[PDB]
Amino acid sequence: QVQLKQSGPGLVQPSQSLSITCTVSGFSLTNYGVHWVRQSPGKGLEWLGVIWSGGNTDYNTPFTSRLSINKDNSKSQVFFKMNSLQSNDTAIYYCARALTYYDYEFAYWGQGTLVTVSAASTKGPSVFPLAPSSKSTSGGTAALGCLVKDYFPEPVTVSWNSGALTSGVHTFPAVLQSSGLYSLSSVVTVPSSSLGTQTYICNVNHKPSNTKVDKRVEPK
Amino acid sequence: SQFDLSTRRLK
Amino acid sequence: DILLTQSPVILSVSPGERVSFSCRASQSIGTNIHWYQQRTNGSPRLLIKYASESISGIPSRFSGSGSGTDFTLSINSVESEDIADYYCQQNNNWPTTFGAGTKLELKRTVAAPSVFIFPPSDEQLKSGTASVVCLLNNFYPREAKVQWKVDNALQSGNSQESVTEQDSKDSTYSLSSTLTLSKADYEKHKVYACEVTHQGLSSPVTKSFNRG
């Protein structure tokens, strides 16, 4: 199977440089070019450039002087680097591959890397339980969750029972508090009859700060 | 059309 | 650079209906246009290439047509998992450019929210902050009112709301309202009430608790 897997999301200080690694499998960088695209709130989807099978590069015009793309064929890695970032370079950066070696129809994309350009510091979240009670139980269905509070920057991933619990899960979009830190909740609805038998754990991972917390959520 | 970085969806 | 204009910004349809997206180009680009789907938290997915040519693994309900400057992506019978944003891309002229996208929303029958309230955890209280969470689960449509009251006093400006994107399986929304106060303020009051108003309720629903 063809895959592009990118390095993790993170903070970059203004005026500083961005580095992303794209590791591919299921094809060889000697046969295919690898493209870079970003998606920002202001400018939407925006093609940045490409490194070709033979090592040649093209950069979209506004980035020619602050962009370098490199690779190591043997390691199946493509390296993206952009200089002197300002806050409006905050975006999701993707690496991508076309259907044919010479083309631009992007059939394979990396998972994207959220890059935030801010002067602030990275802070991991506190994780608190949202305990099921009778004030959260209707008709045999109980609601429960985790409050994921005071982190920066986006994103944070949340799963339940190590991925084994997916149905009934809602992970809310983060909101920015006045403190300049993000907060979200993640909830799930379950049978109330299972609260005595099953354990419920939110698996929280804030990659920019390397903060991993597993929070057990119990009725009070 | 404003793209949201959190959800990857238009607002 | 070629400018691509997608219209309208938002489409709203019912399941089973046919729907069309428009992509118009600032000058002729032949049939050199590709279409993409973006679902919640996802990367783009390639739907159609060169205006009309099919892509492997893509449902037959997706087709496209057009040439010159006026292009159309169609879905002949919309399903719930088609909730997404849709983008066009031209590559007749360097550099390749994308349109700004069209959002596809799905209509469904009215569904009242299920409401739950969560007092702050003793864990959170230890840090000197109190978050009171009120959850509105699986409802349609998106419009809803949350009114917070502490000891019959209307709270204002001290809560934040977050609404999920439309659920790809049942087309509902979920909403979280979070009331945030200092531990000191929290300890000084007894009754915490979350009141919910929605088109699907024949009456406002209140969920509340007394501290301790």
Numbering used by the authors:
A (entry chain B): 1 to 220
B (entry chain E): 1 to 11
C (entry chain A): 1 to 212
Please share excerpts from the published article on this structure.
Recently, a unique binding site for a cyclic 12-residue peptide was discovered within a cavity formed by the light and heavy chains of the cetuximab Fab domain.
Conversely, replacing the terminal cysteines with serines and thus creating a linear peptide reduced the affinity over 50-fold, with much of this difference being reflected in a decrease in the on-rate. In fact, there are two copies of the peptide–Fab complex in the asymmetric unit of this crystal (and all of the structures reported here) and each complex was refined independently of the other (e.g. no NCS averaging). As such, we also observe different conformations for the termini of the linear peptide bound to each Fab. In the other peptide–Fab complex the electron density is very weak, precluding the building of Ser12 into the model. Moreover, the hydroxyl group of Ser1 in the second complex makes a hydrogen bond to the backbone carbonyl of Ala100 LC (dOH⋯O=C = 3.0 Å). The remaining residues of the linear peptide, specifically 2–11, are nearly superimposable in both complexes (r.s.m.d. = 0.14–0.15 Å) and superimpose well on the original meditope peptides (r.s.m.d. = 0.44–0.77 Å). Of note, the SPR experiments were conducted at a neutral pH, where electrostatic repulsive forces between the two charged, deprotonated carboxylate residues (Ser12⋯Glu105) may be stronger than in the crystal (grown at pH ∼5.5). Weaker binding of the linear peptide is likely to reflect an entropic penalty.
